Design a protein around this ligand. Sequence first.
Ligand SMILES: Nc1ccn([C@H]2C[C@H](O)[C@@H](COP(=O)(O)OP(=O)(O)OP(=O)(O)O)O2)c(=O)n1
Ligand SMILES: [Ca+2]
Ligand SMILES: [Ca+2]
Ligand SMILES: [Ca+2]
Ligand SMILES: [Ca+2]
Ligand SMILES: [Ca+2]
Length: 901
Amino acid sequence: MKEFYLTVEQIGDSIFERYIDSNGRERTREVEYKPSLFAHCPESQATKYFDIYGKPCTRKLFANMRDASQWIKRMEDIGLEALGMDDFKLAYLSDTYNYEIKYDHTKIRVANFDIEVTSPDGFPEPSQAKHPIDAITHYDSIDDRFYVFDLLNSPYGNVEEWSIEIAAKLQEQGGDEVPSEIIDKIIYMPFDNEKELLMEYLNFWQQKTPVILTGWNVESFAIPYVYNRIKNIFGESTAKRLSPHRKTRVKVIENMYGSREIITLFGISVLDYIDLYKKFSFTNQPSYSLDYISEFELNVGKLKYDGPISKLRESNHQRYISYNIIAVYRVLQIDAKRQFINLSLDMGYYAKIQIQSVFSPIKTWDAIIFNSLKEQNKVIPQGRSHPVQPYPGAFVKEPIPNRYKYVMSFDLTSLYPSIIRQVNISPETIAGTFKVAPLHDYINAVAERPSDVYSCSPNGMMYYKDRDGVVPTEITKVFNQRKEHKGYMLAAQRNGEIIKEALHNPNLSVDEPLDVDYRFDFSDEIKEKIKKLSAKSLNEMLFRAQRTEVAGMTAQINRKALINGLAGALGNVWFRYYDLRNATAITTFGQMALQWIERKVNEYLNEVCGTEGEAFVLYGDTDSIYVSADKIIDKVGESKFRDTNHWVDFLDKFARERMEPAIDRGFREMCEYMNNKQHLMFMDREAIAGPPLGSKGIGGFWTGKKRYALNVWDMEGTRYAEPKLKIMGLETQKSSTPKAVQKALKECIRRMLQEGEESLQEYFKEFEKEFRQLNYISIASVSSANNIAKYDVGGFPGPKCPFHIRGILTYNRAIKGNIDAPQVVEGEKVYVLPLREGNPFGDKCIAWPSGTEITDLIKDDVLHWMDYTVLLEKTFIKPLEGFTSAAKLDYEKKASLFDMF
DNA sequence: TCGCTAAGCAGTCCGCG
DNA sequence: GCGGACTGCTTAG
Ligand SMILES: Nc1ccn([C@H]2C[C@H](O)[C@@H](COP(=O)(O)OP(=O)(O)OP(=O)(O)O)O2)c(=O)n1
Ligand SMILES: [Ca+2]
Ligand SMILES: [Ca+2]
Ligand SMILES: [Ca+2]
Ligand SMILES: [Ca+2]
Ligand SMILES: [Ca+2]
């Protein structure tokens, strides 16, 4: 096989590399790598190395990496550019793996672990590690085994061995319901004392040294706790055995308002799953506890136990160990679904970076661009310091707040990467500048043509047309990979809809789900067989279709995230190719594009309708426009349509056959106007929306910018079995909105869009009447909690104290003198509830850690004093008032003359 | 929360005769 | 009460 790296590190003048050799074996080596860097040189000096601007360079080969680093410093001292890859491990990877890396995940040791620490006096601080580690579960991907290290004797209690038999049993049999499919994969090791547990764990670690190390909060908790605990008991040299090169470093992670410490383990790639999830999932969650995320992702119930976690080991050690094992498995289950590890490996190996660098788009693109340029013997420029300066972004049209009955949306494909490729935007393709007219003059095609030679953006920039820049070349490669995965995602989605349709008529028979590839549209044969299947087989197929869609989503959305990240990195001062001229060339071109095409669509539709100056485009944001289709529908007349699907087909055909060709013509003219290198403004129909035929539904509404709701029948070619609400920006979409309130507001919107005013009034009356019965957690607001200390003046709110922070201060007073009570953690999320006048907490609200029940110490009082009235007005009534006012609708029936009978 | 801009709403403080 | 200046937070893209 082709060899591939696992990890790479620089330690002084040595590169330490763990890799898979040509026989599939894991190896380690120390290489005394001599790096090269570059200086500009005279024309007369014949060279094969040129900087990105075509200026000649001489290569300087250093005796060692420290010499190269010293040279960089001296060049700064002199005031001359030191060119080349200054991150020597990336240069090493480039030299050692000079080909597209083909990797084999089955040879990469992926370790998933979780530790337990019993702590009487509150949260066990990983920098102190003052409490024994009493359980470790460590899953190894190569062995496919869960290794359980169980401490039976502790100063906090001696316990009996954990029983796998009881663990397997149902909760209803007194068991722990450890999933049967992992029961045979558990390797249980009880220990008489902590020292032998930890020593054996290190020997195990040495035999089975993780390459990728993950779990939940492993970087912020488990890793530093294990390191520091071993350090405290045995000394530093023993703790450093967690590194295959015996090198570790305390790394201080700084933010706006403080800092924290993590432990860097040289020769290991830590990908904490909580951070992979935050980066790659595109969710914003009210809580990031593993129980909360597992419930959300997997629909598995919360792990239930009695008493506080600090007494679980002594009261129920059996459950304590079982829950440690389940915790590790939950993460593997999330990954089986989301496939973020697979994604990280794909991106890391593509860029030729340390796998953990996937968290940094700057580092990822730096390595991609470096490798690409190196292929042509070109030399990368030195990074420079730049002051942070704001720059303009996208255009967002101000909508007229209203109901909108029939709506068709159109969307530019991968806008910013397409702009980059179209205009040819790159550090080395800058050709010069032209005199800019106001943007509106370009939008209306009245400004002078920028250039007859170069490719232009309306910010005043001109670019070469003879050859692609490195940024367009490399962005195109990832754009093209994404396209394939988006295709699989959309096919799986369409396939899902076929199964949902068939589920209306399940057959009374015993059968199996079909063995099919959900990444490809079902053939007619598969479709025939589906129509004959039972509900059991159909639901199983639906689950699989949906899992395939998720896999496609992960692969495609994060590839999109990376290429959009390149556009954004051009405006980050730490990027090697930072240039506000280029960053702004992209965004300003985007503003023109959207407003240019708005004008073109209005002009086209006014022509077909035989009108003048009517606004068909009701809204736009960045890369999309929303077109009112009422007049198109009315031109044939609603009576002419057999059903909803009939007018959806008609609008689908109108968009594809009439509007898209008109949009294309409009954008080709714009390309010529800007003299761009290649026309790549591809704007396709996105959504078709409206009320069910013959209903009183309003179809859609806008309240303002980035705030709207549509009843959608077709999205990007997916024809839904049932209409889907597309709600953007409204309170139903915000993690801050109470769970039950999101749900109620969503149903109010559904009724508005699908059924009309009377249906809405019916539901509102019932909700208002019954909501006081809702569970307190379901009606609590959520907020991130920053700067708690800043606003804390002797336990009371300081000037300008935010509402959620006030609530935390209230909580803190109420739990004062309890080392046991859960503490609110700076920077994390809290639930927030309002309190009625004259309550014993002495303030108008209380807040406690999100994803948890409030402590029993005060729960009864909180429930008794909760202000339901304030809760309802603020979270439900006020947003609903916004929705209905915009839609020109009433949520309460107004009095009429009919009331007199 | 270690790892692009536009823009919405909640809440504080205080003016507005 | 509402709105503007301001902080804080969370969206859409
Ligand atoms: N983090 C982000 C997100 C978006 N955008 C900009 C660039 C995008 O091109 C544009 C629209 O983003 P979308 O994700 O809505 O869709 P794209 O057009 O990028 O991709 P698709 O091909 O899915 O339409 O907004 C950005 O600069 N940075
Ligand atoms: Ca735990
Ligand atoms: Ca788009
Ligand atoms: Ca599209
Ligand atoms: Ca059937
Ligand atoms: Ca869009």
